[PDB]
Paper text:
We have determined crystal structures of B. subtilis NrnA in its apo form, as well as complexed with substrates.
In the crystals of NrnA H103A soaked with both MnCl2 and pAp, electron density corresponding to the full pAp ligand is not seen, presumably because the mutant still retains some residual activity. This density was modeled as two Mn2+ ions present at full occupancy. Two bound Mn2+ ions at the NrnA active site are characteristic of DHH family active sites including those of inorganic PPase and RecJ, as well as NrnA homologs. Metal 2 (M2) also coordinates with aspartate carboxylates including of D24, as well as a histidine, H20, which is substituted by an Asp in the RecJ active site. A difference map contoured at 5.0 σ revealed the presence of an ordered water molecule between M1 and M2 that provides additional oxygen ligands to the metal ions and may be activated for nucleophilic attack of the incoming substrate. H104, the second histidine in the signature DHH motif, does not coordinate with M2 and is therefore accessible for interaction with the substrate’s phosphodiester backbone. We can take the product phosphate seen at the active site in our H103A:Mn:pAp structure, the 3′ nucleotide from the H103A:pAp structure, and the planar density outside F162 observed in the H103A:pAA*A to build a composite model of the pApA dinucleotide in the B. subtilis NrnA active site.
Author numbering: -6 to -1, 1 to 249, 251 to 257, 262 to 275, 278 to 280, 284 to 285, 299 to 302, 304 to 306, ...
The structure:
């Protein structure tokens, strides 16, 4: 039909052929990972009870509530179909026995710089891999695929995870229309958002500190150092603090860096940032870019 309709049917055909299917995602998983890898796993469990389907990898603790993962022998990979989602690079795949199956399938929305797999479906126009999986489902409908409540919730969590609940510019028509269909399943989006957005008191306090102390140059320049005492004063990791860099986004008139000792993260509202050089788009403090 649509060169696309053909590609998706080929993945569906291949999935129907193999009795054992093992699914992976990228290390340091995020909602999209859990949405796609596990969204598909759930679709295949419901559609094909007679097969042996497994999702492998190391759990992220804040994401567990979504789904729990399987631990699998080396022997189970023999003759198995392996599907890997949301991972641009083979060296970032979680659980490296990914190419020891009979076949390997790449499903991804990042650029195809590492074109791995026997079968590949890689669209950079998708908002997320979870969205790609809903699409794959739609085509699988004709072929007897079933979406249950669990799977709906997974895919929906992955789409809101990669778009910042329809905030970022990777949101498309398809993203929103698909979201529409998903929320007709009876999972609580409210419970879901509460779980996704839940933040430990100590991190909140930290954010606070940051907000209280941010300063702005007349050219919209802003900077945040989270020195030594600070990370201990608040009892927060490097990982927890660095992850607050995107909380300054709405300050009126901001055009900032971020930082943090273990690290540099940078963000803009205009002036590209793939510039400031120190091997997406206080010496570094040449930032006031904002000048021009
Ligand atoms: Mn991801
Ligand atoms: Mn993704």
């Amino acid at each position: 039909f649509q060169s696309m309709a053909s590609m998706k049917t080929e993945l569906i055909r291949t999935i129907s052929l193999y009795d054992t299917i093992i699914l992976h995602r990228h290390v340091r998983p995020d909602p999209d990972a859990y949405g796609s890898q596990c969204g598909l796993t759930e679709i295949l469990r419901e559609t094909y009870p007679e097969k042996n389907i497994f999702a492998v990898g190391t759990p992220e603790p804040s994401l567990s509530f979504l789904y729990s993962l399987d631990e699998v022998d080396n022997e189970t990979y023999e003759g198995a179909l392996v599907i890997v989602c949301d991972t641009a690079n083979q060296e970032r795949i979680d659980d490296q026995r990914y190419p020891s199956g009979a076949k390997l399938m790449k499903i991804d929305a990042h650029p195809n710089e590492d074109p791995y797999g026997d079968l590949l479906w890689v669209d950079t126009s998708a908002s997320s891999v979870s969205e790609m999986i809903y699409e794959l489902y739609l085509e699988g409908k004709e072929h007897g695929w079933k979406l249950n409540t669990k799977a709906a919730e997974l895919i929906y969590a992955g789409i809101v995870g990669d778009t910042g609940r329809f905030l970022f510019p990777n949101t498309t028509e398809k993203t929103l229309k698909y979201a529409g269909e998903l929320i007709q399943y009876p999972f609580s989006s409210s419970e879901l958002f509460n779980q996704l957005y839940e933040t430990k008191l100590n991190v909140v306090k930290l954010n606070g500190f940051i907000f209280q102390n941010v300063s702005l140059s007349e050219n919209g320049a802003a900077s945040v150092f989270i020195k030594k005492d600070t990370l201990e004063k608040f009892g927060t990791t490097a990982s927890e603090a660095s992850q607050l860099v995107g909380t300054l986004g709405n300050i009126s008139g901001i055009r900032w860096v971020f930082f943090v000792e273990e690290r540099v993260r940078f963000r803009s509202k205009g002036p590209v940032i793939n510039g400031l050089k120190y091997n997406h788009p206080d010496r570094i403090l040449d930032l006031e870019l904002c000048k021009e």
